[PDB]
């Protein structure tokens, strides 16, 4: 199911970029407003 599959791609992509390309951690809740 494409609803599932497309989100699954997000896991695949992000894993690769994590050890292959940049490995950055920009997607984090670094907001200290909470």
């Amino acid at each position: 199911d494409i609803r599932h599959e497309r989100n699954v791609i997000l896991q695949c992509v992000r894993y690769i970029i994590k050890k292959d390309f940049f490995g950055l951690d920009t997607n984090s809740a670094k907001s200290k407003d909470v």
């Binding site: 497309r6 989100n7 690769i16 970029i17 920009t26």
Partner: protein, 75 residues
Amino acid sequence: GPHMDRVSLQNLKNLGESATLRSLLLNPHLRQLMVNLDQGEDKAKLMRAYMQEPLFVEFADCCLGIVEPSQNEES
């Protein structure tokens, strides 16, 4: 909700081990798609615009077979 829609790292790490999938990363366009989608400038339209390019389609269809524990019903 999308709880088990998230893949375990084992399955994801198996992608880089797949000789077929790693060979897709060799495409400068495909790798640009990957990084663009991750940055999330507009994942909303990217998810659509990426499924029309055969390069990303190959990547997607390849990773599915590696990360999906979901059997083909009764095949």
